[PDB]
Amino acid sequence: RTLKELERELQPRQHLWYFEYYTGNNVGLFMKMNRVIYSGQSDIQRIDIFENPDLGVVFALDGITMTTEKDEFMYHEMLAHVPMFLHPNPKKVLIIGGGDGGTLREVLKHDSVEKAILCEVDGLVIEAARKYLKQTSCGFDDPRAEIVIANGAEYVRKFKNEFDVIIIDSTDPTAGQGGHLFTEEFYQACYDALKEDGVFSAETEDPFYDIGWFKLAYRRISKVFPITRVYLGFMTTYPSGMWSYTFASKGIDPIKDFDPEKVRKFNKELKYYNEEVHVASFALPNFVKKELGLM
């Protein structure tokens, strides 16, 4: 008999675990692993993809949770739909980071899109996502999607008055090639690469374990864009579960220029984002307002 003939459905036990440490290394998340699907090392970072009984397939970079099959929609829908719905007619989009493809998948739901560029620094992440993370990488096959392997901070500088929307889907500033995507100069390059009525969004971490970088990202973006507003969203497997995103534009206000009918009439599936959540996400708790210097 051969191995395959004798194999049965793999059942989880209490012996294999994934431990993710949060900034500071005093608190973290642990997950049981039924099996490890892939472990790879590029010139940039380490990729691990495994299966958890409750979360499904989990993707991690350098021991930091990037996506889980059960809840990635929460993050990708909030990072992409806010700017996409606010733009009058988004045709050309640039996504920096997001090798898993989730943000690209959400952006592609918008019929106005003619070209979506996914600029990921690590080619191995793209290859691993194409093969093992089909839930998020389904957009790779879209005729309008173009994948570019490059450092986003260097890539965006090559363009001026080119994009309608730029979305930053980066790792933590201290993780991997992240950090390059957090400079004031970088944000200026994004501003210069957008057209006159362009919009922008960037993941700005949890205002809890990563309060430092959250504040810094907001300061730098607000110094470049006339309109800069932080919005929050639940993210059930990210550090603290309280995630922040920063919307920015050259005039379009995230509340005053929001047309709820665009969302009500959307022809694609949305598992988190909706008209009420859009406006609600901009309501900040007092401690967050205090950090940003608002109240």
Added chain:
Amino acid sequence: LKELERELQPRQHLWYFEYYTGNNVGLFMKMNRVIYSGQSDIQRIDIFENPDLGVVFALDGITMTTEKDEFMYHEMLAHVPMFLHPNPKKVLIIGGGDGGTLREVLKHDSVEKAILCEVDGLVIEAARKYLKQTSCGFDDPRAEIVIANGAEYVRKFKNEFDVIIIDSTDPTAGQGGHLFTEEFYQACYDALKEDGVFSAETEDPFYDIGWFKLAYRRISKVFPITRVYLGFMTTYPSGMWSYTFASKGIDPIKDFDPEKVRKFNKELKYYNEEVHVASFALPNFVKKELGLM
């Protein structure tokens, strides 16, 4: 020994592991020191110090409060129904042995009497001794602390309270479950005055989806107005916590007066007027689980 002791420094050897429902995911925290470990006839109490979260309080290995973020939970559970009530004078809080909810309730000058009904006397005593940050309202003359099963205690009252807040452990944890039956919610309804309001912690709609749904269905079957609101809770399972507001007619949005919150003469670290309204906007997956979509 006393002369030789120095400030205790954290290492990587002592840990607290909190398993979430299902035992497949959990949270881990480094422990610099264990302040107290005690066992009552009901459950086990552990209070320890974590370098980032400060003092941590756990019941049967489940995180109850953290010095760094407990305000997020307590402010949302308490201030939503308190600010919606026209003039809350008499309040009943079931559970909440740590005292956080009582503390928030006491910030409203309108309160003349607030009963804190905790089932475990050991929790009250541990909170008084080690959790000063949340048990600060224990000596307030308006506060009355009683030890009893809230499910039975509430039955002593009819047309008595302006606000009833359920600050309970999980439906499967230490004496909980008594606080999640339809019989219980009806008694809460009966214990409230004609225009009374209500709030109850209804778990995270992620690891504890089952109990979240059941709590909503049971509450909605008793109260004419039943609405779920959400809030961030940085150290609770999933970080997405739900609370269910209920009333005999008062609407959480339609009858909300943002001015009352703006002119509030007390400190609020999470809750505010825009957050109050925003907390009721539910993401699609939550609406779907509740049959609201």
Added chain:
Amino acid sequence: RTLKELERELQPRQHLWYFEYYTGNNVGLFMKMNRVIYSGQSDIQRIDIFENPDLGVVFALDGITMTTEKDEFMYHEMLAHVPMFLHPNPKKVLIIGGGDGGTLREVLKHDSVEKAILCEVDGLVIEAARKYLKQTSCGFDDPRAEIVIANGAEYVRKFKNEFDVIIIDSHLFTEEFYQACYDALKEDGVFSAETEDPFYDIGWFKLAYRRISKVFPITRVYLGFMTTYPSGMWSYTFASKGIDPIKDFDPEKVRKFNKELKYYNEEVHVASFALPNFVKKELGLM
């Protein structure tokens, strides 16, 4: 550009771990995992094979550590060589369990062996060992080796006055099973069974000894270090129909052995039978 073309040597971090809980679930061993080589489930149990930076390839069954490349020799040499060297001319050997192949590998070092049957209950363990545990399964293809997929307690009762040596590697602990091994051995046959650590598994250690002692006239416990098994103190039980492990031991056979031994030697053979007081007390040997 290509996936394989972008891959580099995998570096160990602090996020993947293997936790082995000991009997009682109050203490255990943890190991960092650089990668998981194989995870599979048979009708009988779960197999996990992974790589640890210090121990090398690690093989676990149902979350219990079975072998480690760094130290498996300690266990396999003590379980196998004590009975093999004590037998005057071991030609036919039966090994029950030992799916990894380690005991089989040690037994095959003895030139007198003509046939060594490896009776493993789970075929998936044999196939996984053949593919991923080359260090221990190297004897699978030896013409003298015969692999049988069967329950050892059922398989052994098919034989009478057949084997010179029987070794029980980690139904296989009943008095009737031991009696079946006794009946399957020749008049001068010898036996060894791994009998656990007299620490976390003291209950089973005592029971195994009692049961073996009710069948074999000569029953003697010996001990050895096993650096990755629970407690590090492992016991083995030698048994026979007359051959004494100390009195009939010939040191010269070991001194002149022409095969590699990384643990076992003539001094260790005799020393392994010296039992600390707490062990003697547990077995009632004063």
Added chain:
Amino acid sequence: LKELERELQPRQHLWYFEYYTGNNVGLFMKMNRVIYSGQSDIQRIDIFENPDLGVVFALDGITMTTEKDEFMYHEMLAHVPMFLHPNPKKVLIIGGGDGGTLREVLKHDSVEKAILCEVDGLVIEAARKYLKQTSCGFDDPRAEIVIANGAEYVRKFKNEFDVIIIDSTDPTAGQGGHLFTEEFYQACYDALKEDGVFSAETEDPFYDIGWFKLAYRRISKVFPITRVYLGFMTTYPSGMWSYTFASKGIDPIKDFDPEKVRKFNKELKYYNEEVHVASFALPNFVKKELGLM
């Protein structure tokens, strides 16, 4: 509060993790409660209760003693040299603040003076209060506790002691520690009388193979007779522990009289005549490491 307290039961939330050299493997233990955590100017002390092992004492997250099995280590470290000496009257023990080695040494009626030289006074104080199983001999009229650095202390003596035993010291400094230098071993040699004997714990020849080889090499450059012996130690890294016996002529096998052990009037839970001799039989890998094949 004490009136409400019941016997504390262990759950699955509190843990102690010990990392072995290399940090790729380690041991974890469940904690029912933490008895004492303290920090001296030298190291951190943690004493807790484990359901199977009883009271556990760890220094800087390295397991030093466990109630269930400390006898294995202390008996082998102390009894081998004690029974080999003709008439041990004056004994010096360096390290071992828990007191176990001292306890075993005191079982020998010939002893008139046994000095326990511990570098950290907090260890002695904590052992008195929380490690009664091992510190029971601290107040024996023949015992003297000295708080000092053993490398400095031993140099104050010449032709003074019958037996010197080096218990655990500075676990975190590894082979580079002050108690593993040729200079220190020479000071020990000089402090011993003409027919003195010596033993030192020399680590596990698995995770700490280098440290083990270094200790043996340095001890052997000083003493004419140097022999490694091994013992089981059920909660130490790898479970295979080594000890190095040394003397100015007394041979551990040629001068061993089993009758002294057989007639011993005190309790021994590990050590006996067969084990004495057997502990000197080294597996091939150990012999190769020491250059004895």
